[PDB]
Amino acid sequence: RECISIHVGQAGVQIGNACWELYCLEHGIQPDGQMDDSFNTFFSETGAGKHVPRAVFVDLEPTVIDEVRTGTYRQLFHPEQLITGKEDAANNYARGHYTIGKEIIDLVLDRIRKLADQCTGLQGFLVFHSFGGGTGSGFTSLLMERLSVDYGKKSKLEFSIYPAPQVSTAVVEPYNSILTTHTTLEHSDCAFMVDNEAIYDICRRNLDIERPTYTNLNRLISQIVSSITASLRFDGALNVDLTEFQTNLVPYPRIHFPLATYAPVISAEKAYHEQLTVAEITNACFEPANQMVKCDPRHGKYMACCLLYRGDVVPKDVNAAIATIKTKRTIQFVDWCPTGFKVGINYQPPTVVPGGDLAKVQRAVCMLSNTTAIAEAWARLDHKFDLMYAKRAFVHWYVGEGMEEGEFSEAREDMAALEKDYEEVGA
Amino acid sequence: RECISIHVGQAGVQIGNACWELYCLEHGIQPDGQMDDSFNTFFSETGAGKHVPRAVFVDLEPTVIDEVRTGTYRQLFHPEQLITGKEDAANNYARGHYTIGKEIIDLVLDRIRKLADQCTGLQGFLVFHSFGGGTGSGFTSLLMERLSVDYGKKSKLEFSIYPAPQVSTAVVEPYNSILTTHTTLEHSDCAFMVDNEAIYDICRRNLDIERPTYTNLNRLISQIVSSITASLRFDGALNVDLTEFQTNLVPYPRIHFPLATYAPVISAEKAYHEQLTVAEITNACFEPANQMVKCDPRHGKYMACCLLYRGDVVPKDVNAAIATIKTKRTIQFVDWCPTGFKVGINYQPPTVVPGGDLAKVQRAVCMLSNTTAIAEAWARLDHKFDLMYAKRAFVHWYVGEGMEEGEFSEAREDMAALEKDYEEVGA
Amino acid sequence: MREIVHIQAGQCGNQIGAKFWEVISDEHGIDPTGSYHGDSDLQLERINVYYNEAAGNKYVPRAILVDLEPGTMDSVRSGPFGQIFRPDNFVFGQSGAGNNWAKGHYTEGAELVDSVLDVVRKESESCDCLQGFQLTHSLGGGTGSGMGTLLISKIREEYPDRIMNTFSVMPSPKVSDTVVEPYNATLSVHQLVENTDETYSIDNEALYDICFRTLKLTTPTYGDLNHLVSATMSGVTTCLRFPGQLNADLRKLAVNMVPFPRLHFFMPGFAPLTSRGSQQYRALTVPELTQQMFDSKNMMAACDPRHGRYLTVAAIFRGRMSMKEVDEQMLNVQNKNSSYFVEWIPNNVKTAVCDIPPRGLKMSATFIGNSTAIQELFKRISEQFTAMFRRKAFLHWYTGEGMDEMEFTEAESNMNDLVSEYQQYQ
Amino acid sequence: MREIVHIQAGQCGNQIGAKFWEVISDEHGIDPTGSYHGDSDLQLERINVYYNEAAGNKYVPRAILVDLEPGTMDSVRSGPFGQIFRPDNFVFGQSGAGNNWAKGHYTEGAELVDSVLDVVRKESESCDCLQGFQLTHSLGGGTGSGMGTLLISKIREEYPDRIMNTFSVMPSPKVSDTVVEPYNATLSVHQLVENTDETYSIDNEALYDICFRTLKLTTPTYGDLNHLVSATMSGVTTCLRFPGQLNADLRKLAVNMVPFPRLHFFMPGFAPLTSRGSQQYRALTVPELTQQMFDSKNMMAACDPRHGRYLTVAAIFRGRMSMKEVDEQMLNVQNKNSSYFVEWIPNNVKTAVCDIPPRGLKMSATFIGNSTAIQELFKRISEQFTAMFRRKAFLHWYTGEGMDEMEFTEAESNMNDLVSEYQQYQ
Ligand SMILES: Nc1nc2c(ncn2[C@@H]2O[C@H](COP(=O)(O)CP(=O)(O)OP(=O)(O)O)[C@@H](O)[C@H]2O)c(=O)[nH]1
Ligand SMILES: Nc1nc2c(ncn2[C@@H]2O[C@H](COP(=O)(O)CP(=O)(O)OP(=O)(O)O)[C@@H](O)[C@H]2O)c(=O)[nH]1
Ligand SMILES: Nc1nc2c(ncn2[C@@H]2O[C@H](COP(=O)(O)OP(=O)(O)OP(=O)(O)O)[C@@H](O)[C@H]2O)c(=O)[nH]1
Ligand SMILES: Nc1nc2c(ncn2[C@@H]2O[C@H](COP(=O)(O)OP(=O)(O)OP(=O)(O)O)[C@@H](O)[C@H]2O)c(=O)[nH]1
């Protein structure tokens, strides 16, 4: 029972650097590399008294790789695992997928293949990236295509960052997203999306961080992606493995776009004054402003929901919590899945980083929910894409890389088909 | 009532070194060479308070002889018994039979003759070898030809290691086996064959040894070859001598190829949890995956079976065991021998090496069974031989030794005649 | 003499089976290691019915554990009585079923059935005369619902004369911890209704209602529910495990409880169940026990028995008691509630008694009821299955293993036939 | 008992031979002066296979050094282990070959062959039973390519039954440090293919690719490459140097690796090879060793083995390890890559093991492969030879020593025959 966690782009490598410290603190692994089955999922054992993670950090530019090498987690990671390219992607899907990728995918595929051959209980892979930029779109699509053609049956967990409606970091983000989603629709078994302004607001209103940073944003993301696999890592009363996220939450082979959220989020002084029980966190996770994506769930319906609890929580109180949530009529479930809940529990509680913003809480929950609220966001993305596509804005860079307008049109009609499928299944 | 145990090749000398420690521990002889009729079969009496075995270890290369001399069982064996050659056989039947043999068989024949002249109750000989290599094929054939021409009537127990279907140690093994079996068909009274992967699997699935070695493989082989002669060594309610394996199990003068298996095989912690009685071991010995050769007994039929029990076992329960085994229709016996069971019992129980993998069991059984399942293995060996023979692969080494294609063709047609005889008698 | 073969499949199945082994070992006076330290000779008189004699006065259980993940095996081995089980019986795969019936029945079930078949064959050959195959599984999830059904089918093919007993836990609409649970239930009931001879239907919300109402426990975990179901699992098997003035083996209760081959889904029950602080303020006499046996809230199923009619019920008592009191109590029970018993049977009640009660209680009883009230729990699962199936939802995963929609249609038709069968005799 | 006669010719040949003597002396625990200071008796058990016993517990190697200049002899004498060699064996001329095959084979070779023949005869007479003649040389240049070939021819004439083993370094188009190098290679391969029984083809660019990829050394000199090739040179000879559970001498591996007399150009390999700063993050277990043995980039030849098919391979392991693990690893290696192994042989893999690994490593292995991929490296040198030969370029020097163009034509025909032979069995 293992799984390999690969990272692409600045967002991916920063999330990996922010999360592997949490993993090592959870497993009791010091940064030097030394202190039975809990760490076997993510960390190997090299001979005697030494561990190495099952991860690779790949990026075309070296500005992230050299600082990761010269940081503080130097002795924990394998020096050869940190792959580095030679040229900048420059927010260009074509440049990240065709020119610069082809000279390093040959090494990357061989490296993941040989590090997977020694492994035997690999459940799947999880890829960290961001379609809002160039590297995390192009190289991710390039690797996932030739990974799906080779393995295919094995599961892939995508973790992507998407832009906000009113805010955007780049300017070619809708082109990058609409181009890469045409390939992500068929090869990605399931893909969790996160919005920047939602995760800025969640630490503003609740955690009371007036001036947050990307480290503070990535800490709770690391908590989420550690809590989903905490069931595999540690024993539980009702364990859920990685195949549950494929089997239960993907009712159709192409409708595989769930939203994500987490609770409780609370500062140190507020933790001692707010009580922790299952009811308030269950009410807050379904709260619309508490989500990690700026989408209104009230406009749509929930297709499926998996609740994963951590800490000393009995089954009875969570059963009562989901019962009263079902009787609550503010939310609305789809008629095609009345049994739309999948509850699971792990005994190992959440941990806290020394000096981190998060506080000690006796129990927690992560809520990955498949719903039709993302259809509005996709339609918004296509609407803002069409305005630039009509004027042929930012097209000379792409066509000067090797591509044309044909695959742009195919991306447009594929997004239209996605909207057609979503409005059809939401009826 | 005595018998001399000669060993040829790396496999033979390693089996001898692994088994004589078991024999001396059974007889209570310390490794130095000192502590009434039980040890007389295998050990002589050197004047007063000292013993020496009735064995010779012969090998063309000296790499086994010098380490046997400089090991820990130094004083137990004679200095002159350990025969050593001068040149390597190099997986070459011709080189092991013609060039290098001729300068040491003159010493070996005289040595066995003079050490047999002092003996008077010699029942026969048992030779340990392996046709999968060069020395154990060539020198064994060379010695057995001129032993059969000299003695002839005396019995010879052959003990050979054969290659697996999907695994092989060498690359010229089918050439060696098909060449040496042409001579082994007429001179060997009975030859027990063992497969490497079967004995790897028997200690994997049952004994729970994830990383075994050749010592662990040879320990149970030593237990088998000690248990067959335990009836001669120690008194029993129904003793069986060495001539029973010739008279009862060889219905025809050339069909003398039985398979071998043993029970119980169990680890120390599992031994205290599992109860030992005759029924489960009798069911397990006839189990097809429990055999020491990768052959399916269900595809063929059992021609004959001799059960030899050790330990405190009454005749009644084993009679009931063979009765219910006969009524069981999963196995199938041949119509030419309905009374194809030969039961024997010895009171002396199996022993355990200090620190050995095997556990203490109050009773045990060894099952040497004549069946037609080996016909498929022989046909497989001939089929893989024909592919290399068509291209004349690895033929220049043999023809550069002195041989030709004529005896290769005679070996091929002799194997075809063996298959003809087996499919004829299996009808 | 009438040995029983125990097989455990799925997470909840192996958990409740381990608790069953724990409680019966405590009743027999068996150490966690495996040694006997009992006080009464009757415990050792019928220890062979489950446990096999071993060297050093040690006893090993005739238990088979099969799970499609190593985690459940590690947990039950690390449990209080994990070491008593045979290490050879710990057969298990690598990959989980992922809450898919098709994976458990076709892909990994085919890979593990050949591994478990020879093991159960060896355990059947070890005993003198196998009585029946007792199994525990869950309709919910994929692992139990596929692998236990396939194992039941193969054992039915191998032994078409022996008894097939199952203690099956099934879902509810108020408590449902799986999205594919109606699909798994609808697929598993098609195999259960045809192959198994006996079937005890257990509902999680029923046990939760029990623990809220009569136990009044503050923090009820799965451990309390395991002890709850283990009580009835021991109550059914007490008759062959100890002597009694009127013994009723598994076949004896089956002949009374199974008027037709398909109508064999029972409604188990057990009493007395009370809090430790309210034990002094209750009389344990047989009328106050019998009223609790037939109380609507005391049963281990969510169905209301007053909304239906009993086809037939059985009461297996334990402890010294008066047969006249038992007879007159069952008489007034069947008389005063004649509207709730079917008129086309003169006596819808079976009685049995054992002379050795559980430790810590002076008298006890277990109730096994076959009634038309189970049609409610059947039809709610049926319409839950139909609502998801009518748009072909949650089937692209099932189609990967070669499974067709005609099989789901056949399962739906079987469910319709079963509920109409239960409605016929009402 | 199975002594080995060691002969060294050419600059690179004597350099790698001196490094081979250095590393095996370090393994045996031999001082630079010649005294024994080892800890294990097994080192002294088979020290006679190379070294000759002398007075004062001193050991002198059975090494012959021959060079056509005094500079190489001065360098190897001034090296760390230069003093241990016998001063009598330092046979050498005055004038160099000037990178000419004809001068090394006819003019100075004839003058020095009578001087070296009696020396090798004396060393062969000193030992009890010579096993085989191990040689090191370079196809490039004139000195090695002429004198080593002539010495091989005379020793083949004198001992037509003994084994002839050669560790020959050959050029590449990307790294070629000599203008007459294709001519020297084409002339030397004609003598190598007919006389020698075994031949390990080594490429400089392959070792450079190794040092870039897995060693990651900043300043790789020739000393690192000498240590690299010395590892496989010790790996092949470990079986007769120390005991093992399955010993494979030079003749034993030759019988498995040489299916035909001409197809004896192997592809040596060795592992583990890792940097000092990354050894902590790599497991030395036998699967991760075996995958490195069969890795395309880990071999010591520039040819891509995936572009061809293996005729046969041999793996000689060192250190305590599980034979079942070795067997199943070789099984899955030969099974999953069945397209890259010839179908007309059932088992294309040989295995051997020794029980004493190198100092500083717990387990190790060496890979010796005969494959059709060497035809690429042959045909590139062949067309390089043909492009220069078709206009008779660089032959006025060769004609001075009586050498004719018919000999070059015969060598080209032999090269064509060899590459077509390797293409036949693909
Ligand atoms: N009364 C109890 N019920 C349990 C327990 N554990 C689980 N369950 C209930 O049974 C339901 C499904 O049973 P399982 O946990 O065994 C799911 P299964 O192992 O068969 O499939 P996979 O785990 O996906 O391989 C589950 O949703 C619970 O409602 C338990 O310990 N006690
Ligand atoms: N791996 C190594 N390769 C070497 C080394 N020295 C030389 N060479 C390579 O071998 C090539 C030719 O081998 P030599 O240096 O021995 C030329 P040789 O002495 O035989 O002829 P002359 O020096 O002209 O008398 C040479 O061009 C190098 O590519 C070395 O120390 N290590
Ligand atoms: N949430 C979050 N998003 C990030 C973080 N770092 C980068 N991103 C997102 O990543 C997007 C750009 O991704 P990339 O294509 O990989 O940008 P890059 O790594 O600088 O690549 P080049 O500019 O081509 O060199 C931006 O629009 C950001 O929104 C982070 O730390 N947290
Ligand atoms: N089961 C078993 N087989 C062994 C053992 N040792 C060697 N063998 C087998 O013996 C075969 C080769 O036998 P030999 O011809 O004697 O090999 P050798 O002694 O090294 O002889 P040369 O290589 O010619 O020097 C191998 O293929 C092995 O499978 C052992 O300890 N146990």
XYZ file of C-alpha atoms and ligand atoms in Angstrom, chain D residues 9-16 67-69 72 96-100 138-145 169 175-178 181 202 204 207 222-223 225-226 229, ligand 2:
71
model
C 50.703 -4.282 -23.353
C 50.175 -0.666 -24.376
C 49.844 2.494 -22.311
C 46.166 2.065 -21.417
C 46.637 -1.687 -21.069
C 49.406 -1.451 -18.490
C 47.580 1.387 -16.704
C 44.347 -0.578 -16.241
C 55.981 -1.717 -23.704
C 57.880 -0.291 -26.678
C 59.000 2.832 -24.713
C 55.273 3.644 -19.364
C 58.126 3.695 -30.069
C 55.672 2.427 -32.660
C 54.441 5.898 -33.631
C 50.820 4.665 -33.789
C 51.581 2.148 -36.566
C 43.862 -1.189 -27.071
C 42.690 -1.509 -30.656
C 43.689 2.121 -31.081
C 47.318 3.020 -31.487
C 50.025 0.826 -32.952
C 51.893 -0.604 -29.967
C 49.110 -2.601 -28.328
C 47.255 -3.400 -31.555
C 39.457 -1.151 -25.336
C 35.915 10.172 -28.908
C 38.824 9.294 -31.224
C 42.307 10.362 -30.086
C 44.202 8.940 -33.082
C 42.676 4.369 -35.152
C 35.235 -1.670 -23.803
C 35.868 5.066 -23.599
C 32.796 5.004 -19.326
C 41.758 8.172 -16.464
C 42.241 6.903 -12.899
C 38.034 4.752 -15.575
C 40.837 2.386 -14.550
C 37.210 -1.436 -15.541
N 40.308 4.364 -19.971
C 41.717 4.825 -20.344
N 41.976 5.019 -21.634
C 43.221 5.435 -22.034
C 44.182 5.644 -21.129
N 45.292 6.041 -21.786
C 45.010 6.072 -23.099
N 43.733 5.701 -23.256
C 42.890 5.550 -24.491
O 43.424 4.357 -25.354
C 43.821 4.998 -26.716
C 45.053 4.303 -27.322
O 45.729 3.508 -26.292
P 47.313 3.822 -25.914
O 47.391 5.099 -25.088
O 47.849 2.712 -25.136
C 48.309 4.017 -27.444
P 49.753 2.783 -27.427
O 50.484 2.899 -26.138
O 49.228 1.383 -27.585
O 50.833 3.146 -28.748
P 52.055 4.133 -28.625
O 51.894 4.981 -27.357
O 52.098 5.020 -29.817
O 53.424 3.292 -28.541
C 44.080 6.202 -26.414
O 43.912 7.064 -27.579
C 42.961 6.576 -25.234
O 41.658 6.832 -25.851
C 43.917 5.443 -19.807
O 44.790 5.637 -18.972
N 42.695 5.040 -19.421
